[PDB]
């Protein structure tokens, strides 16, 4: 793998450690989350991001950060603010961006 893929795998491992319950591990389905496909146009999750790094589909850290922000944004759009899901989305979005920008 390329030096960029190795960097992105490093960031992904540290970001997924912020979600020990695995809520962002795999794609949401409308069985789990009624109406999700009517609300969310562009789903994202950590498993999809890992497959994209392995396939060498990210040109830059910028494109990788955009998928991580899309994931967190979708969770804050679908889930209400008082839920575990919206609170973790907001927490990890900000912590994960500061981690990747240091």
């Amino acid at each position: 793998s390329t030096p960029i893929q190795q960097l992105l795998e490093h960031f992904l491992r540290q970001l997924q450690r912020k979600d020990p319950h695995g809520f962002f591990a795999f794609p949401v389905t409308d069985a789990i989350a009624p109406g999700y496909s009517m609300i969310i146009k562009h789903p994202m999750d950590f498993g999809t991001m890992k497959d994209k790094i392995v396939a060498n589909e990210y040109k830059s850290v910028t494109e990788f950060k955009a998928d991580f922000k899309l994931m967190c944004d979708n969770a804050m759009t679908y889930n209400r603010p008082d839920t575990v899901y919206y609170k973790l989305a907001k927490k990890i979005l900000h912590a994960g961006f500061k981690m990747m920008s240091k």
Partner: peptide, 10 residues
């Protein structure tokens, strides 16, 4: 019905 099937309190 807006919300996940479990409350994610594992």
């Amino acid at each position: 019905g807006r919300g996940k099937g479990g409350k994610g309190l594992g």
